[PDB]
Amino acid sequence: KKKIQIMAEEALKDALSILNIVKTNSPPAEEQLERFAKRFERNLWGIARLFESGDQKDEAEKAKRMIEWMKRIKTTASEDEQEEMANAIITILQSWF
Structure with missing residues (x-):
């Protein structure tokens, strides 16, 4: 399961883009944030x-919860909660390298 590297790299770029949107904009670019979250x-x-x-269920639910966290980023109004x-x-x- 270890070789998931290009998917994690792209996911890291999207996460850093959202993080940049949350901090840079005071009211964030909501449609661009939706584009990266998707x-x-x-x-x-x-x-x-x-x-x-x-058969790595520990890292699988870890990946699953980070989907719930990204969905929370879409929902939450607190910029600090988005940053967190x-x-x-x-x-x-x-x-995961």
Whole structure:
């Protein structure tokens, strides 16, 4: 399951883009944030499936929760809550190289 590297790289770029949108804009570019969240969620659903196929359920639910965190970023009105989830998502994706 280890080779999921291009998917994690793309997911990291999307997460860092959202993080940049949240900080830069005071009222964020809501449609551009939705564009990156959709791509990110898609990438991590695949990462979760590859971990499931590789019998690595611990890293699979880890990937699943980061989808819920990205969905929270879409919902939440607090910029700091958006930052929190983005930094958490970023640090976990990095654990996967």
